[model samples]
Target: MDPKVLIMRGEGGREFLAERLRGQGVQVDYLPLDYPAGELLARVRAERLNGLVVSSGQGLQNLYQLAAADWPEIGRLPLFVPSPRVAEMARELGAQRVIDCRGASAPALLAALTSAALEHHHHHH
Candidate 1:
């Protein structure tokens, strides 16, 4: 984990993931972004981010409000959700794209994140 990751809003199991990531002998930084739960698009615009991960509807709502309810172009970033229902809600709320995990489980989310990172790597090459 030579690279740093700004783990986006779903503040549930991120601490564990961070511990897991660091435990496995990698150099990475986990930046937790919070909003009361916060368009995050501006951070991306700064070219400081590689991806984004969100797993809850509540977080999505918080994002909606943080974006000023203008429906920002969040789809441009790598977005991940916990289920189809949540994904649908995210799309309706504004995301142009989303990756759905089978359930709100760590394994499912890790799988999704794995795919996303690999996909992102493939594209970069």
Candidate 2:
């Protein structure tokens, strides 16, 4: 028996991932989170995030807008992006430590984050 998968996404992307998971015979639990750009950005900036892991370009745009107000204290923090598209978006927003993992899947994103974490540790420690 396949394990249950819970997918959380905004709208279009969620549907896309859900369909793919269903096709693979995985029991999927879909939780579509609303993309409240303004609110989410405010929250992100307030949280003082050390690193921003953005999977989609839309989320990156929102972060840019929020960053414009105060820049989110993310000047040198690393960004883990799943695809080149998101990396481009982050670069456009002046993110220097943007890493494009090539693949846009969850596992690829996780791999990129893990690699980034290891690299950060190696450099800082």
Candidate 3:
């Protein structure tokens, strides 16, 4: 059986990741979640976000505004970025944990996540 994956993204981002995952024999369910800039900014102010995973440039831009308001919180939260572009954007916004994958694909991003997960588990254990 193929692995089931849920891809939460907006606009072109979803299709970009979905194509790659599908090629890798992963069944993808695309869930488009539009990020409301105002709501997200409010959430950031409330310190309700633990980390930010950015797959698109748009998402990163929205977070950048929030980062400007509270630079400390933005610098502390981990950012799981799928592409180099996203990484650069996150860095500009003062993100600390910006993990950059080589390819802007779901499988590549998943591989990076898996490696990080294992490394984190090992250290914790």
Candidate 4:
């Protein structure tokens, strides 16, 4: 399957991420899960997303809260996050496998994402 990542933030950083993912032949879907946790989860449950990318603690918090319930699908999917603090937060929040990309750095995050995609490709093959 093509790597279709669902990103939760619609801020400045998403532009660089989208561009890089597109250049790599992956489809990027921006779904701003900024509403209440329940609504956001409801929205997420409907989409056929391959993976997830989140940059904010609040978004992680929402995921953390809904983890046990309609959530294992995403909980199991690849998660790309920014920052060490957010990395720590994700670990505590129980994200099984998280790619902690450099905090808001386009080049660093892109490199990591490239590495991750390669690893995922090998695993699937």
lDDT of each: 0.56, 0.54, 0.57, 0.64
Per-residue lDDT of 1-125 in model 4, one digit per residue for the tens?
35566767734587886887777667787755554556545545566455677767877775656554656655656677767887777777667677767755545545554555566457675
Quote model 1's TM-score. 0.57
- Residue pairs clashing, model 3: none
Ten contiguous residues with the weakest lDDT in model 2? 1-10
Output the better candidate (3/4) by TM-score: 4
Give candidate 2's error at residue 107 in angstroms. 8.1
lDDT of 1 by residue, 1-125 (tens): 23334454465787765675455443334444453312354555454444455657876676666556334554555566767887888788667667675654544444544555555667675
TM-score leader: 4
Pick the winner on lDDT between candidates 1 and 2: 1
Clashing pairs in 2: none
Model 3 ranges off by over 4 Å: 1-9, 12-38, 41-50, 102-125
Model 2 C-alpha lDDT per residue in residues 1-125, reported as the tens digit of each score: 23243333543476675565456554455433454435534544454333455547876665565455556455356675667776778887777687665655645544444454455457664
Q: After superposition, how far is residue 47 of candidate 1 from its true place, in Å?
A: 4.2
Off by over 4 Å in 1: 1-5, 19-39, 103-125
Ten-residue stretch with the least lDDT total in model 3: 43-52
Q: Return the candidate ranking by lDDT, descending.
A: 4, 3, 1, 2
Query: How many residue pairs clash in all the candidates, one count each?
Result: 3, 0, 0, 0
